[PDB]
Amino acid sequence: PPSNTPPVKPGGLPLLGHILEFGKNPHAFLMALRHEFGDVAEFRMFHQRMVLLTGSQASEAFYRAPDEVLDQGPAYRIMTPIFGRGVVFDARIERKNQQLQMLMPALRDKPMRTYSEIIVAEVEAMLRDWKDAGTIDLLELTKELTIYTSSHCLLGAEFRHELNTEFAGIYRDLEMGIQPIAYVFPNLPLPVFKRRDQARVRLQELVTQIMERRARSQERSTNVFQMLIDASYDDGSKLTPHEITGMLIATIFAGHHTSSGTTAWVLIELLRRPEYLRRVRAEIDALFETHGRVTFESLRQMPQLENVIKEVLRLHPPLILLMRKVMKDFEVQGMRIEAGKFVCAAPSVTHRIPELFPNPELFDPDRYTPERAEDKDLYGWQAFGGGRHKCSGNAFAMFQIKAIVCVLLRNYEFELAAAPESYRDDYRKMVVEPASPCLIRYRRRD
Template sequence: MNTENTVSAHKEPPKMPGAWPLLGHMLEFGKNPFAYMTKLRNSLGEIGEFRMFHQKMVLLTGPEANEAFFRAPDAQLDQSQAYKIMTPIFGKGVVFDAPPHKKDQQLKMLMPVLRDKPMRGYAQVIVQEVEQMIADWGETGEIDLLEFMKELTIYTSSHCLLGDEFRYELNEEFAKIYHDLEKGVNPLAFVFPYLPLPVFRRRDKARARLQALVTGIIAKRAQKAEKSEDAFQMLIDAQYDDGSRLTPHEITGMLIGTIFAGHHTTAGTAAWTLLELARRPEYMHAVLAELDAQFGVDGEVTFQALREIPLLENVIKEVLRLHPPLIFLIRKVMQDFHFKDYTVKAGKYVCASPRVSHRIAEVFPEPEKFDPDRYSDTRQEDAKPFSWIAFGGGKHKCSGNAFAMLQLKAIFSILLRRYTFELIDAADNYQDDFTQMVVQPVSPCRVRYLKRVAIEESAGESLRNDSQETAHAGPGFRIIIDRELCQGHATCMAEAPELFKVDAAGNLTVLQENPPLDLLAKARQAEKYCPSKAIKIDLN
């Protein structure tokens, strides 16, 4: 745990040997960041220092180190200073480039679109997009799976979060703009974000064009009597604490941030989910049995139904364990940071690597094995806090994690019931591409699809629903809230309005200190579905 005990925290982290003048460890790190960080952990343990050009980096791995990293206050470990790479894309004064009090207000403006109530309408939108994408597939064919998922997830994310103009009126132009912005997330931008390179010039041109489009849509919407309910409109209507409104420049940056969160990492995860299932027929058959039992031939894909397919959810979690899309998460040390008996001096950077932490055998036995049963009720290998960190952790945990999981489950609830998939190339040819800032399968990523002839007879009610909880006998229970983790999604209020209330600002109030046992089942549901895992139910 992070501590201010300077008596015990006095040693500097051990350093990796082999740094080159000027370059540091950048050459070896750049070839394969995961292999390098794994080597660092194996050599130095849960904390170790390396150098990227002139920047001194300290890698923290394992549940205890992750917890110290994610729970540290912003005044000590600053997220904004570490992500200046995004400033040319989001814009100056937006999110990571904004002062802390302003950044917090901007992020809160986006929370309503990720709350429980609007989330319940997204499933139908995603289903509609999937059905349109595969409408002309026919009986069989071949696709580049990664390119297909990139296209599909940009449609689903823009439709759900941005509104009809971006999905239908600006479809092709927005896709081109987004592509140029995405390419601007280049490793060089960590150190030299404004070099006069073609990729950065296209990034800046795309940003300016998008702001012009946003300004035009704002003007058109102002003429309409009926208001939309998407993130775009929420940002148009939002106000800072002083009553001022967001500028088109700020709205543009926050819309970009919304889509990056909803699409940038999901396409690769969707592709890997299908690839892992395609090379493991036993899990593919089990997932198909679960989907057929839940939805039948034409069952409606609803928000609630998507909660009741635990095997598919566990498959996605295992994909995210083995193939987390982010190489590492970074913070700049603003005040000396202490972990156990080590001190990281202000001015350095600390980072956490989901991929390295997810492959620690003491936490996840046989870590290289694809095993979705790790997350079953009997094993719960991810139960230790900060062991599974695919979406980050602490108060900066990805606020879109619930939307990402909903999106993935909705996509596969249609895709897998309509078609079966097989790999075209040898299974070992499908590998992670570490040359990109967001890790995805190497392209091309070819698969063959075949239309399912009939739904297989399988799996009964035991696969249909694991969400029903039975109240334990006993004298009572209490609700424990980790305020550092709570993000104000309001899922708990939807599950148990008798127990929880979340106000417009995202502040959570527990309504009953000693709830009666007949509310235990609802409390358990709130605990289970809290996206940030901020609720714990303790039986007295």
């Protein structure tokens, strides 16, 4: 009497499974898998057996599982050298959870007003460097803008001014260390891998220096770094500069390409839909004539723009595979998923289920008005994941993007360099953004 298990896609290659076809187009693949096998569908990545949970029901099973059924550890094994050993997600389930819990208040509530001012200020700042008119690569602009605003808010002014050029190069070497051989996490050593390892060492050095310099000086700035210094375990014991360095890098990687890509898409989508450029522009111009400046209070209630960002995240979730190891038999929609196996959510797929998002392929922000399609189901729309391990900085992300767009749109008029339909997702990236050659034209407003 064997229990009903989920269907397995007729395999491809012996030691490769489906990996090449999947790798060709991860999204197209997962769409195809679901379309042919339904809510719960097994495929093989190398040796390993992945199970795609799509739809409201199967998504709930995923996001609500205890940390003791589904472990996010292996998904991050490529990151461990960058984050440090035993720092966060390499740490024991209970220790990992305290570190994450220390971040949450750093990225919500009280510091949010300060972050707003810093982010607004940082964009206003760089915008003074701009010619009257010109052509820029939109993706590069939002990646620069995001790393500046992030690092200022998360690390502090030290890393924007005094440690600017030093940090810039560390982050590069850190970023460059994200190579899928390390993602297997099988062998750590290589030329680029040491330049990665050297980078983390030098950052932990820079951190401790600033810890010590901010302590003998009675500087008290508002940043995640400062709050991680002031945080403490339930022990009463404190974070070591190893941990503080690990958590700050995790936060920056978690927030950088995700935000930068989304800001790009919010501008692209607004620039190929004049209808919505007007609704957003009218909202901003209204915001200024009611506040005379971009202000934490003003950013809070931008319904037009919130709705646009929400639809952009429906059509363009930057993270499209959320992977977990099954370390306990749990059951999804009747089908039993064996321990030792892998499960994963696919925001990009579930977001196009017609039963959840009527006319899924149509861009319509008005889905997210009081007669909504994001509220009355919590495991439909899932761009920020869900459950115990949902994004800590969804609030930060929303303000970051609302601020950048507000300022850019208020000072500058934009128009696409190439044909509107030519702007496509590049699903072959670890974090999905628009295609690399993503040019745009600016000219000072009025």
